[PDB]
Scaffold this active site. Sequence first.
Site, mmCIF file in Angstrom:
data_model
loop_
_atom_site.group_PDB
_atom_site.id
_atom_site.type_symbol
_atom_site.label_atom_id
_atom_site.label_comp_id
_atom_site.label_asym_id
_atom_site.label_seq_id
_atom_site.Cartn_x
_atom_site.Cartn_y
_atom_site.Cartn_z
ATOM 1 N N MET A 1 0.817 -1.207 0.000
ATOM 2 C CA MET A 1 0.000 0.000 0.000
ATOM 3 C C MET A 1 0.856 1.264 0.000
ATOM 4 O O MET A 1 1.193 1.794 -1.057
ATOM 5 C CB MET A 1 -0.949 0.002 1.203
ATOM 6 C CG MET A 1 -2.175 -0.879 1.013
ATOM 7 S SD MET A 1 -2.870 -1.526 2.546
ATOM 8 C CE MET A 1 -4.069 -2.690 1.897
ATOM 9 N N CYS A 2 1.221 1.733 1.190
ATOM 10 C CA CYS A 2 1.845 3.038 1.335
ATOM 11 C C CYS A 2 3.343 2.974 1.030
ATOM 12 O O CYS A 2 3.952 1.903 0.963
ATOM 13 C CB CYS A 2 1.604 3.578 2.743
ATOM 14 S SG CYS A 2 -0.131 3.589 3.264
ATOM 15 N N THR A 3 3.938 4.154 0.841
ATOM 16 C CA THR A 3 5.360 4.278 0.547
ATOM 17 C C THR A 3 5.885 5.561 1.177
ATOM 18 O O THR A 3 5.222 6.600 1.126
ATOM 19 C CB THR A 3 5.626 4.282 -0.964
ATOM 20 O OG1 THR A 3 5.080 3.093 -1.550
ATOM 21 C CG2 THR A 3 7.121 4.333 -1.246
ATOM 22 N N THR A 19 3.358 8.280 0.786
ATOM 23 C CA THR A 19 2.280 7.919 -0.122
ATOM 24 C C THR A 19 1.182 7.206 0.658
ATOM 25 O O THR A 19 1.465 6.463 1.602
ATOM 26 C CB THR A 19 2.799 7.020 -1.252
ATOM 27 O OG1 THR A 19 3.995 7.587 -1.802
ATOM 28 C CG2 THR A 19 1.767 6.890 -2.359
ATOM 29 N N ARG A 207 8.206 -0.691 -5.117
ATOM 30 C CA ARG A 207 8.200 0.733 -4.801
ATOM 31 C C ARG A 207 9.312 1.093 -3.826
ATOM 32 O O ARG A 207 9.789 2.234 -3.827
ATOM 33 C CB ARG A 207 6.844 1.145 -4.228
ATOM 34 C CG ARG A 207 5.652 0.704 -5.058
ATOM 35 C CD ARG A 207 4.351 1.178 -4.434
ATOM 36 N NE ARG A 207 4.332 0.984 -2.987
ATOM 37 C CZ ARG A 207 3.786 -0.063 -2.377
ATOM 38 N NH1 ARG A 207 3.206 -1.020 -3.087
ATOM 39 N NH2 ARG A 207 3.817 -0.151 -1.054
#
Lengths: 326, 325, 328, 328
Positions: A1-3, A19, A207
């Site tokens: 999901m997030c970064t 992110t 990512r």
Amino acid sequence: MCTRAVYLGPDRMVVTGRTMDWKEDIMSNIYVFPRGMQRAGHNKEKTVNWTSKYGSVIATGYDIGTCDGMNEKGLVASLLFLPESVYSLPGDTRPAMGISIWTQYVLDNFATVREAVDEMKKETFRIDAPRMPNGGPESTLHMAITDETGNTAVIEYLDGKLSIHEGKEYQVMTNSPRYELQLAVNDYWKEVGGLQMLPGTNRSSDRFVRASFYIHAIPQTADAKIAVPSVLSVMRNVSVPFGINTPEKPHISSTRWRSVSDQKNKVYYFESTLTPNLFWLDLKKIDFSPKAGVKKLSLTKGEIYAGDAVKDLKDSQSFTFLFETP
Amino acid sequence: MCTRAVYLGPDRMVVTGRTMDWKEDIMSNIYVFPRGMQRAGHNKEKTVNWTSKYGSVIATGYDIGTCDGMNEKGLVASLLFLPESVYSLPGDTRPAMGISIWTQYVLDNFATVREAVDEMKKETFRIDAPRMPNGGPESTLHMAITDETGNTAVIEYLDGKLSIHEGKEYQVMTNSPRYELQLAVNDYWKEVGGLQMLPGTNRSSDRFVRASFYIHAIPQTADAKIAVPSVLSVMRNVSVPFGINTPEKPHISSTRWRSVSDQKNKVYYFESTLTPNLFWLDLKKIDFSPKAGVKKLSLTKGEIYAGDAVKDLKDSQSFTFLFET
Amino acid sequence: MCTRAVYLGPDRMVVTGRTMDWKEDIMSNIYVFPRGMQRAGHNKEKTVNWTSKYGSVIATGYDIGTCDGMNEKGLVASLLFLPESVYSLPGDTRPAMGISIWTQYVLDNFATVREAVDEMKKETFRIDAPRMPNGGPESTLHMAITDETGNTAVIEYLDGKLSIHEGKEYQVMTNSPRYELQLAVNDYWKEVGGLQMLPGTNRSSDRFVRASFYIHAIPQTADAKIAVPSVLSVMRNVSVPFGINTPEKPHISSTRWRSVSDQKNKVYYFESTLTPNLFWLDLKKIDFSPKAGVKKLSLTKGEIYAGDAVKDLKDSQSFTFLFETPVM
Amino acid sequence: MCTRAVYLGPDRMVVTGRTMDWKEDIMSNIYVFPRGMQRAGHNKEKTVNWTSKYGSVIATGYDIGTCDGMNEKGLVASLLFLPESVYSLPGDTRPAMGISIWTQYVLDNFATVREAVDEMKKETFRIDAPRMPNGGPESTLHMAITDETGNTAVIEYLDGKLSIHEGKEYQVMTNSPRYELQLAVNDYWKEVGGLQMLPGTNRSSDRFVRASFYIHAIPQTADAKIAVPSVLSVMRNVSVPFGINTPEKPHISSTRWRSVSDQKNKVYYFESTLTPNLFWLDLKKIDFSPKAGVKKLSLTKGEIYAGDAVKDLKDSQSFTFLFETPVM
């Protein structure tokens, strides 16, 4: 999901980009909390208590808890997903802190990563994480903390034990796998060469390597007019396009918003994918005095802000942290 | 360098996104050209002449020529780099249209890709492409045209002979290689699967694969509030981070601005890497009457626009199309 | 399916390796054909006739056709699979050349690739390709030809039209896509770098890239003591492991044997994945005189050969060239 | 450099393959030690002593130490390179075990990995590793041990501390990085999918991923007719072509030979890259009596063996185990 990725430029230029990817509308809002507020980490369990030493500018998730923010002293916290997290084993009778207020705790009480790591290593309390609303996933997340000096701490709970990586070299963070295994995955792709081949999928490790390579290649500048856009640029690179779906993978988490924290000038930028403008909140123009009151910059009903958004801050009551199943 | 992607949504939804990648400040401005203007393909060589049949909103390059724009009828033209382009063979005595005006020529005279291809396949004129100023690359470029029906044409000049790929399925375009060979590189990576592995470098072929995969995965909607940010999210994925450099490679083509042209609602979106906002120009609110006056949306001053910038349009002179050094 | 790589070394050192992957057992056998033989490219249709000018050692597939071999003059022909092959258009009244013997036609009548390309480009005959017997694939294949000069030609039939790629740089050939698009895929990976990243999948384009990169990185020498084991190491790297299967993919084409032709010294090396030895047939010790008799190296009965196998050659009759699809 | 893979088939069918990748010629020879031999783990410092409980068939490296082999009870020990290996810290006064004889110590005294893992977890001795002779590399290596039960143990020395990973699932081993980190890299590629994209370079992690995927994809059978050629398929895929060189990389470690150990039938297969044949030493045909005579299969002089090579075993004297680096 997030970064998440942290840029370390010249003359104490520390810029953190984050992110936010979610399978549905996260319905995130911005809240401005003044210093001197008293909170509890849980409503029904034995808990700790504290009074906020530093005011903060935070972004919520469903208005049920804090997942990303920044305080007066340039300390940035970010709650990113990690499916393999187990905060405690059965039979843990320590004071319970809710997963929703865990991020708000480190922003309210610490001005330095050194301060946060020293207190969190005491392991005085356990993390309580119920299932997210709308029948969503379990609240399995880890946290990264970065101060204005460039030091970063990656906090994650694995099968009930605390795991911490502290150092300026730990600038990037995504989701699975574990952080030591994530570095091993990143170490392999640096041998391949970032300019030669880069994993360009929306996967967690993909990512991570793209953010790790690009964050070191952007210009080495102390001017915010260049650092913030280029740090944002690598955020959109590691972002995932909106509404990505395939017949064989019908529902995938798309990027809903991004955040870029200028930890040197104490500015908190923010951008939503479905809104055209990148606005910000200059913490140097925000009154964090205990008598200032709670202020909110709402984003749920599709409001469009631009430039400095302190003008559009409305007086509001703080959202209620949820510690329960619904 | 640059990347182009065409979105084909439901109910005649056509949206074309484009990136602009350059090593230095391209110094691009936006110009609003009314219809009925008279332009020439060169100033010192035999040429063709024409009166603009349709007004357009275009973006320039160094204010010496047009490289991206959209006209009244929703036709979008984009001039992207192609280092192996050879426009003519020695001894070509055809009329010589400059490369700086070639993109404007298509946006001025054609409202349909079918019309643009039919006129181009007569090969009445050749392309005279001098080198870009101040030690820049030599102007080797190919172009892509997309109308409001979804049809797309890819025009390349290879070994002096004009090659054209037209069809709705040719939605993505980048730099090297030539378009048939580029499709084979994308065919190979589709065997791997976009979710399994995607090439994620700033290479031309890699940006082509990520653009083609994501542009078919974004939601199939007719709402501009969803389609425009979706294709705009795809253009950011195929963008190059700002100021990328390594010890091995001192200068690398960085993304400077993006453009998303809503071809159904006739809206021209635009944002810059170093500016925080995404502004747009609604062509329905623009007067393209023959004597409305040329208007400009300046960008070299570091100005910051937001929302609709037709309020910020100022009277201006048409920029000088360069045909020599 | 199959991978082909040509090594170009100093002092006219031309070594060609080739793999052979298949679903089941190929039932391959090696045949030695002397000169002066007559063959008709079909059994029932109008056909062209020819008398063999050059003898050759060849490998078969199911003993129904020729798919790999080498003649006396150092010319090596290999028939590899190409699914998108369309050999002729409807209404073609040209003489029919069976796909089973098309490869033998090249080894029988041509000594250099220049003579083979010149004769093929006349387009005198069409390729008649019946369906493989007993639920087999469609007979859609393309052929590569290499002479002792080192020149190589890739011959493909695309949409009923003849396509040729001649040149010494055209050293590697796999399966789909067509050779024009296949070089574009290989060019992309050359932008990546062979040492930095190579595609290791057993698919056609990936085996092409590894064969293209490793055939140029092996030592440049004229010594067959070094070149032949090096070329074999390249063909083994691009060869797919044996009996590979997954629950999602029950049947995968698996390498069964490899052949390496020393076109300089006229030596034909051969090994099978299930047999431990790499044997060879030195063409300089073979009598290709018009009435030397047909010889055959049996490989279907699990035979094991070692070293020079000319002593193991047995008197035999030549196999039946299949031109139709048998009733089952 | 080199890679090792373990195949786990039905009916206790355990086959272990191993490659030998070296810059120059490794000068390897095969020795057959009977049981009951006495040796010491070092020459000049304090050491342990032992007598052979089991005889072993081993391969050497420059004939200065044991790098690969198999004993009577089906135990296979393989010493592969690991640059980050640190065997001890300054101030260690434990008995010194030479790295050259460490592999011999395991094959001599242990019949299962459980016995080996238990004896090594005592940490009785320390590994003494001098630099390889004549400008060679530092002797930084790890070892994998597999018994006839299928259980494998990877033993690495990291920051002067012994690290052991025991389990049937630890079937593959290459070089860098640490085995904990090495499994994470392979975990990443398993998400991508072996049939979708495999890393085809010669890197240590890349040959690890290809070995792991292909060692599970080969057919699951108890027949040696299919197992040892299929395990040979994997070790040939993860092998590196001979003499690989580029203008930027003048010297790259190429595969010199490959060994395959049938741990159920107690057969040790072996083939060199420059040799055309795959020969084997049948341990059930070998007498490991306390006084059967130490024998040797010479390979330094270009010898070509074929089939069962117990016939070609010559009586010889055992090599010198190197415990220092010789003066030049």
